């Protein structure tokens, strides 16, 4: 199937003293593989998956150099943005950046992306054509003109179509034993009376990977959304994910309802029914 490599950066200003907090995390699909935390003692990019540990010192030196350089760019950014928005020196603010590339099931480049936010709102984004930028407001418009003058889209398109995809391919190979394994959801249904007359059925999907999943309830074979609840997909903490969907039904009519589970690890969708 398709794969992605993405990096997420967050920088949080600390007005009263010192430099912003900066946290960077790198993923291949839903697997985190590196982190950098400005507050940690190492001051290095650190591994967070076993398959990245086989990279040599040059790799780690280079990743560390780049990530610290990024943190310093966000540091300058936070100062400029406070000025763009005429904000007090007293408040804490946030910059966030995300970028990455996707490849299809042939491992060829499919798409690339970069988005940047200030205080949790879109600020500037690379368009899908990798050639131009979207700016949300007149501050970002200024940034867009700066980034156009410096030919940033061209350099970023180079990364996204080249080195991003090349290293994603390398990781997929080295980490094949987990990164190319799909863990189908382990599913079951539980039953919870709510009164004499109604009961909740809860359809569980556990220990799956990747995170993308669809759970749907049907009643007598038609999709039902009323009287249902679907929780956000959540991390188990061992690299897999969990989700459930529940429906309230009249007691005795449980057999009319089916839970339908779709996931990349399932050749055909699963159907669960209480009996």
């Amino acid at each position: 199937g398709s794969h992605s490599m993405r990096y997420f950066f967050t920088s949080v200003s600390r007005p009263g003293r010192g430099e912003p907090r900066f946290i960077a995390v790198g993923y291949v699909d839903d697997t985190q593989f590196v982190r950098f935390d400005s507050d940690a003692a190492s001051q290095r990019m650190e591994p967070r998956a076993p398959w990245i540990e086989q990279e040599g010192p040059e790799y780690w030196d280079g990743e560390t150099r780049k990530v610290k350089a990024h943190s310093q760019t966000h540091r300058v950014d936070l100062g400029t943005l406070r000025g763009y928005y005429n904000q007090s020196e007293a408040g804490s603010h946030t910059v966030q950046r995300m970028c990455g590339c996707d490849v299809g099931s042939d491992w060829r480049f499919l798409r690339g992306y970069h988005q940047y936010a200030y205080d949790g709102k879109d600020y500037i984004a690379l368009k899908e054509d990798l050639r131009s930028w979207t700016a949300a407001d007149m501050a970002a418009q200024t940034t867009k003109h700066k980034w156009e003058a410096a030919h940033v889209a061209e350099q970023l398109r180079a990364y996204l179509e080249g080195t991003c995809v090349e290293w994603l391919r390398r990781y997929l190979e080295n980490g094949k034993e987990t990164l190319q394994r799909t863990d189908a959801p382990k599913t079951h249904m539980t039953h919870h009376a709510v009164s004499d007359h109604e009961a909740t059925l809860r359809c569980w999907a556990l220990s799956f990977y990747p995170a993308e999943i669809t759970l749907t309830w049907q009643r007598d074979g038609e999709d039902q959304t009323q009287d249902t609840e679907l929780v956000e997909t959540r991390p188990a903490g061992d690299g897999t994910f969990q989700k459930w969907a529940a429906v309230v039904v009249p007691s005795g009519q449980e057999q009319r309802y089916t839970c339908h589970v779709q996931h990349e690890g399932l050749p055909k969708p699963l159907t669960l029914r209480w009996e």
Partner: peptide, 10 residues
């Protein structure tokens, strides 16, 4: 493998 630090500050 990160992109290098090629974005100008905003």
């Amino acid at each position: 493998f990160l992109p290098s630090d090629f974005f100008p500050s905003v």
